[PDB]
Amino acid sequence: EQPELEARVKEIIEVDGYQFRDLNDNGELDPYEDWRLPTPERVADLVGQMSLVEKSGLMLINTLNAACDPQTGEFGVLPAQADNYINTQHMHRFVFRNVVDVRAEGVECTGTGTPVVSPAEAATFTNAVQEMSEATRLGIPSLFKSNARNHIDPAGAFSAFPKEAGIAAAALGEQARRTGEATTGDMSVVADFADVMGEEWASIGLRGMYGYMADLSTEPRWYRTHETFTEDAYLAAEIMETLVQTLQGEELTDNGLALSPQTRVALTLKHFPGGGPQELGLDPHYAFGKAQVYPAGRFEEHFLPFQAAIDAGVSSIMPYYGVPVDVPVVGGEPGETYPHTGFAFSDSIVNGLLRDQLGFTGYVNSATGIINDRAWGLEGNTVPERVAAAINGGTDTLSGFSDVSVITDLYEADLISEERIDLAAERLLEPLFDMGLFENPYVDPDVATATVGADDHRAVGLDLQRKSLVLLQNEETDEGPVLPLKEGGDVYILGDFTEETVESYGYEVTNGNVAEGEERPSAAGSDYVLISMTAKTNAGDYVSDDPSLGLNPDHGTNPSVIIGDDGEPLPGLDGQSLWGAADVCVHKEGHEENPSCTDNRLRFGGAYPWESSILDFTGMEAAESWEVVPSLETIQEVMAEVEDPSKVILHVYFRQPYVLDEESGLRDAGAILAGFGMTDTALMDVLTGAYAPQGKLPFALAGTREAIIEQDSDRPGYDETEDGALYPFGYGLTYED
Numbered sequence: 001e002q003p004e005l006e007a008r009v010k011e012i013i014e015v016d017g018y019q020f021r022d023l024n025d026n027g028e029l030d031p032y033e034d035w036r037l038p039t040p041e042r043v044a045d046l047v048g049q050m051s052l053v054e055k056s057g058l059m060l061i062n063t064l065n066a067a068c069d070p071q072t073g074e075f076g077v078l079p080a081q082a083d084n085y086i087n088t089q090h091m092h093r094f095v096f097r098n099v100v101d102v103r104a105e106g107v108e109c110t111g112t113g114t115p116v117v118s119p120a121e122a123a124t125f126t127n128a129v130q131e132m133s134e135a136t137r138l139g140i141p142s143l144f145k146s147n148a149r150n151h152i153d154p155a156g157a158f159s160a161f162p163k164e165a166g167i168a169a170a171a172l173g174e175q176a177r178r179t180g181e182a183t184t185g186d187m188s189v190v191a192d193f194a195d196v197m198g199e200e201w202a203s204i205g206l207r208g209m210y211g212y213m214a215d216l217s218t219e220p221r222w223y224r225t226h227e228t229f230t231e232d233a234y235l236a237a238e239i240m241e242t243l244v245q246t247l248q249g250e251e252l253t254d255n256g257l258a259l260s261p262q263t264r265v266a267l268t269l270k271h272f273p274g275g276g277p278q279e280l281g282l283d284p285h286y287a288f289g290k291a292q293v294y295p296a297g298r299f300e301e302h303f304l305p306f307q308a309a310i311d312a313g314v315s316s317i318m319p320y321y322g323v324p325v326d327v328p329v330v331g332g333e334p335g336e337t338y339p340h341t342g343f344a345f346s347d348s349i350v351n352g353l354l355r356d357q358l359g360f361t362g363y364v365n366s367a368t369g370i371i372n373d374r375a376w377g378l379e380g381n382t383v384p385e386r387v388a389a390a391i392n393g394g395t396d397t398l399s400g401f402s403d404v405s406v407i408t409d410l411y412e413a414d415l416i417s418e419e420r421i422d423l424a425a426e427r428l429l430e431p432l433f434d435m436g437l438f439e440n441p442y443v444d445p446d447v448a449t450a451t452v453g454a455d456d457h458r459a460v461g462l463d464l465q466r467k468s469l470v471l472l473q474n475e476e477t478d479e480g481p482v483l484p485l486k487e488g489g490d491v492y493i494l495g496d497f498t499e500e501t502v503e504s505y506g507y508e509v510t511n512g513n514v515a516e517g518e519e520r521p522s523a524a525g526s527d528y529v530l531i532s533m534t535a536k537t538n539a540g541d542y543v544s545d546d547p548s549l550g551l552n553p554d555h556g557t558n559p560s561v562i563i564g565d566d567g568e569p570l571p572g573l574d575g576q577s578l579w580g581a582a583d584v585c586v587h588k589e590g591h592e593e594n595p596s597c598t599d600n601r602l603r604f605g606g607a608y609p610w611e612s613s614i615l616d617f618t619g620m621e622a623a624e625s626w627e628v629v630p631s632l633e634t635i636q637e638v639m640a641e642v643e644d645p646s647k648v649i650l651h652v653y654f655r656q657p658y659v660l661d662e663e664s665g666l667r668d669a670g671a672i673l674a675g676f677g678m679t680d681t682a683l684m685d686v687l688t689g690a691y692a693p694q695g696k697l698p699f700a701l702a703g704t705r706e707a708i709i710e711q712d713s714d715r716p717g718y719d720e721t722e723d724g725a726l727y728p729f730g731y732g733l734t735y736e737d
């Protein structure tokens with residue numbers, strides 16, 4: 001019965017033969033400290049003793065990163081804003097963004113930037129925050145959330161896995177290697193990944209997540225396909241179910257939430273109802289990309305993975321910035337559409353669709369910056385007006401908003417009722433109770449050291465890397481198929497290959513990667529050419545109100561149209577405006593003097609908006625804000641110096657569903673693999689035949705720019721286009737014989 005209790009400032013108290021934490025420092029036992037009672041009654045007693053500001057502080061979540069002071073050699077101290085957030089704003093939810101790794105010798109604390117911290121230092125930092133939390137009047141604990149950390153970027157000491165779509169490829173491939181079928185995948189691969197991440201996250205006291213993403217990659221021009229699992233809703237549904245079961249547990253409360261003291265990481269699933277179907281792929285972080293469109297009528301299909309995650313008891317939901325355009329209200333009086341505002345502001349979306357229609361009984365966490373920067377559809381409204389609209393729309397905690405004053409001022413003005421703040425407070429405290437943090441909110445920094453990156457954990461990651469690789473093309477030469485490689489030979493490498501690691505498999509290696517200014521050795525005479533290639537955006541120069549860029553008529557107009565609920569188009573989104581005209585710096589709607597641009601530097605990712613359809617390697621080589629790595633020109637030189645292109649092996653990182661266009665000559669390679677992040681050891685283990693590739697594509701690939709521009713943003717595949725798919729969902733070759 002008795003759970004372990006740790007208390008670093010408040011006192012433990014003996015009652016009825018059991019021990020309890022005395023968090024309000026009166027000395028005797030309140031029902032909220034009494035872990036023998038059901039959680040609703042602990043909540044009831046806690047919210048009853050709370051001041052208004054104390055309850056409003058729960059409705060904020062903000063970045064709280066570890067810092068370093070250059071003078072004791074301590075990394076993992078509290079940042080500048082730690083006292084203000086906790087003691088003035090009364091916050092208990094935080095976003096932890098530091099890279100966790102072992103720092104190189106010679107590294108002191110620099111200036112700004114988010115410092116790298118070790119597992120033990122990270123757990124020390126979060127413990128120190130928990131200590132300051134327990135030091136609050138009622139000793140309510142804190143919750144840390146974080147974005148993903150366990151994936152290779154083609155993190156730190158966390159065990160490295162392929163990206164999300166790599167994990168789906170491995171799941172589908174493994175189902176295929178047993179059943180001969182690739183539908184919803186073998187979820188043991190997903191569970192095996194989530195078991196490692198859960199243990200490592202929990203070990204540093206990181207008990208909550210911004211994610212995972214249930215978004216569907218049905219629009220290939222969306223830069224965020226780099227972190228989607230698949231374009232298929234049914235496979236997404238299966239992956240979210242498995243993630244929640246494994247990371248949150250299978251023990252559901254009577255409120256229907258998978259929350260126990262054995263919950264390792266509570267998920268804040270994103271981005272509800274589905275961030276996938278972005279018009280022209282433009283992302284609603286930016287003002288030109290507010291709109292989500294549903295030409296194929298698949299609004300219901302996109303929230304299907306959220307249904308599955310809600311039914312498995314996911315703890316939290318983050319709505320996206322997007323504005324649904326002309327979307328029929330689900331379970332609604334006919335002819336009714338959802339508001340043309342961001343999802344977090346529409347009561348019909350958050351309370352109506354999410355809670356009433358889909359049955360979600362947890363709390364809602366806004367995407368970051370919706371109040372100041374991305375209150376889409378509320379451009380003329382003020383900050384307090386936007387805050388009231390989101391809370392009253394059904395959002396319980398605001399990310400990136402740290403001014404609790406605004407919430408209290410709205411209550412004293414009867415713009416938010418005390419019933420609403422009480423209802424938010426109940427929902428935000430419920431998971432902290434069930435997760436057992438009122439009993440023990442601390443972690444052992446030395447066990448983090450023994451957990452983060454454990455040998456067996458990295459092995460599961462290595463296995464998943466090798467199983468995620470997808471063989472798309474393996475030509476049959478007169479000597480047999482190109483892959484697996486034969487033992488020995490002269491190998492030319494181009495791209496992100498580490499020469500000595502390729503030499504290590506018994507090959508003589510010529511390195512085509514030379515600094516600019518040197519000669520590149522010719523690939524003539526090579527038995528094998530290995531090219532590891534990808535494309536990246538390069539849009540950091542974008543400026544919304546610059547007449548050279550965002551306001552350049554030679555860059556065209558923004559076709560996106562969003563009619564306000566007032567009947568007049570949103571600024572810059574009438575279907576005829578310059579690309580930059582939707583940014584607040586240009587339209588200046590709203591209560592502020594000369595507002596900064598929200599879109600400058602496209603700093604979250606994505607291409608120049610007028611280049612978002614250029615996913616073909618030939619197009620991307622010529623584009624302003626795309627780059628092919630290594631350059632396609634160099635790849636084409638290389639493929640020609642060897643003459644027989646059947647000796648070229650292309651490993652492609654499809655960060656987005658890039659298009660192998662016939663004009664580029666890439667299809668002429670003897671082998672083509674799709675990789676989703678892996679060590680060179682794992683790629684070489686498969687190339688040389690120690691393991692056979694078995695991954696299957698979790699999204700379709702097109703062969704023409706025309707197919708990209710023609711496909712429905714909300715529809716998977718390319719079967720409705722004239723040119724169709726180059727490779728379908730579920731496709732993947734293996735070694736035979």
Ligand SMILES: O=C1O[C@@]2(c3ccc(O)cc3Oc3cc(O[C@@H]4O[C@H](C(=O)O)[C@@H](O)[C@H](O)[C@H]4O)ccc32)c2ccccc21
Pocket residue numbers: 095147210211270367368369373399400401
């Ligand atoms: O415009 C502001 O910039 C940020 C920002 C600023 C500094 C910094 O170092 C990081 C930083 O990260 C983000 C990240 C964002 O991404 C969204 O939110 C989540 C998140 O990570 O937070 C993700 O889980 C969601 O998938 C994603 O859709 C949005 C805004 C900001 C911000 C924070 C607070 C107020 C305003 C802003």
Ligand SMILES: [Zn+2]
Pocket residue numbers: 016
């Ligand atoms: Zn008693």
Ligand SMILES: [Zn+2]
Pocket residue numbers: 022023024025026027028029030033
């Ligand atoms: Zn007490």
Ligand SMILES: [Zn+2]
Pocket residue numbers: 025
């Ligand atoms: Zn005391």
Ligand SMILES: [Zn+2]
Pocket residue numbers: 418422
């Ligand atoms: Zn009250």
Ligand SMILES: [Zn+2]
Pocket residue numbers: 053087088090
């Ligand atoms: Zn106070």
Ligand SMILES: [Zn+2]
Pocket residue numbers: 054057090091092136140
């Ligand atoms: Zn508090």
Ligand SMILES: [Zn+2]
Pocket residue numbers: 226655
């Ligand atoms: Zn990426």
Ligand SMILES: [Zn+2]
Pocket residue numbers: 241
């Ligand atoms: Zn099921």
Ligand SMILES: [Zn+2]
Pocket residue numbers: 278279281282283284288289290291292
């Ligand atoms: Zn959009």
Ligand SMILES: [Zn+2]
Pocket residue numbers: 402403404405406
């Ligand atoms: Zn304030």
Ligand SMILES: [Zn+2]
Pocket residue numbers: 444445446447
């Ligand atoms: Zn210890």
Ligand SMILES: [Zn+2]
Pocket residue numbers: none
């Ligand atoms: Zn312990």
Ligand SMILES: [Zn+2]
Pocket residue numbers: 199451454456457
């Ligand atoms: Zn372990």
Ligand SMILES: [Zn+2]
Pocket residue numbers: 480481737
């Ligand atoms: Zn053969």
Ligand SMILES: [Zn+2]
Pocket residue numbers: 507508
């Ligand atoms: Zn040698």
